[PDB]
Paper text:
Herein, a combination of genetic, biochemical and structural studies was used to demonstrate that [name] is part of the [name] of regulators, which represses the transcriptional expression of the MmpS5/MmpL5 efflux pump. [name] belongs to the type I class [name] of regulators, characterized by a divergent orientation to one of the adjacent target genes. The [name] transcriptional regulatory factors are common single component signal transduction systems found in bacteria. In contrast, the binding of a specific ligand to the LBD induces structural changes, conducting the dissociation of the repressor from the target DNA, and the subsequent transcription of the [name]-regulated genes.
The crystal structure of the native protein was subsequently solved with the partial model obtained from the SAD data and refined to a resolution of 1.9 Å. The asymmetric unit contains two subunits. The surface of dimerization of about 1,700 Å2 is mediated by 31 residues mainly from helices α8 and α9 of each subunit and involves numerous interactions notably five salt bridges, fourteen hydrogen bonds and van der Waals interactions. Interestingly, we noticed the presence of extra electron density in the LBD of chain B in a rather hydrophobic pocket.
Residue numbers in the entry:
A (entry chain A): 14 to 213
B (entry chain B): 11 to 212
């Protein structure tokens, strides 16, 4: 029962985030969710508590998408499909983009969410590389930067050009495909330690 | 007087760009003057506000980018010239968080800004078109892709931090690889912005 209201607050907050960024108060989230103000406060005493819950919820969402991508028949199509689904979340919602990348997070819940997501990202990259589709320099830590890159397009271009991020996402994915005439990427992706220290 | 005023202008801009790499846009007008070895009154009369200093830096930055495109067109190979130019362009904002904020987070207008953009844009088109006509660069590419290469590589440095100061070069190389013309590639479904669109976005 309380878990149902918890999901409704998160879903209502993500809807408001696409238009209002992070400016919406807990009262406005409660109205949009159709819940009493005390119900949102009993679930999330502060906005930072709501912000962290949305971040962890977004990671759990990426995990389910990565698990679905690993069920696809072709590992390259699974990789491209996952990148599409991942980047769309933050490229079309400036509030989520601010939480995902322009925010530092920590604590037990955040660590447990990253612990589930990071190995799934590794398996998606590993499978496409083993079948010869994805270039061998690729890493699981390239995935967050695909989200950062596509989100920065929408942040700069604005809502008038709301689809422009798809152009540069397609360019990025094409640059990741393995070709014979490709030079080794001189700068390696961040390792597990570096990507951890970057977003905390 | 024109030779001396031009020297003090380049002095202030170079000192501001050097401070902005470390402090972002937090450096004050007085700190810029001390770093330039110029009197506070001289810099203050030239730039009474931080916003005036940001516009002169931005206009100077487009002039620097115009010179880089000019040099790139003198390279013997059109693809190496395109690669070299994109590297030189992105390095400006990918290694200086203050310049990155001025280039893509501030709004810019006025006669000097419009005149600078009008000289830069056809030079960007010539670098792109040369590599396209040789069969290296994919036909969908446009001059208006160039500012987004700066935005994209800049967001890498913004997210990764100064401890990972070279990471932007990795994703730049990925972007450049994805711009190659291929006999078999799917056409980019979303077109680059036109001049009217990229002027409104800036």
């Amino acid at each position: 029962d309380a878990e149902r209201n918890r999901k409704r607050v998160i879903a209502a907050a993500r809807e408001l985030f696409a238009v209002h960024g992070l400016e919406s108060t807990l009262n406005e989230v409660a109205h949009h969710a159709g819940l009493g103000v005390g119900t949102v406060y009993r679930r999330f005493p502060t906005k930072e508590a709501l912000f962290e819950a949305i971040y962890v919820d977004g990671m759990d969402q990426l995990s389910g998408l990565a698990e679905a991508a690993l069920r696809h028949e072709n590992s390259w199509e699974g990789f491209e499909w996952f990148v599409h689904q991942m980047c769309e979340i933050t490229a079309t919602n400036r509030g989520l983009r601010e939480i995902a990348f322009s925010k530092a997070h920590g604590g037990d819940h955040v660590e447990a969410g990253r612990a589930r997501l990071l190995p799934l990202l590794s398996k998606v990259v590993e499978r496409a590389q083993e079948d010869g589709y994805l270039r061998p320099e690729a890493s699981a830590t390239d995935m967050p930067f695909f989200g950062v890159l596509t989100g920065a397009v929408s942040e700069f271009a604005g809502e008038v050009n709301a689809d422009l991020w798809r152009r540069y996402m397609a360019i990025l994915i094409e640059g990741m495909r393995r070709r014979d005439d490709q030079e080794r990427l001189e700068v390696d992706a961040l390792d597990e330690a570096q990507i951890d220290a970057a977003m905390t």
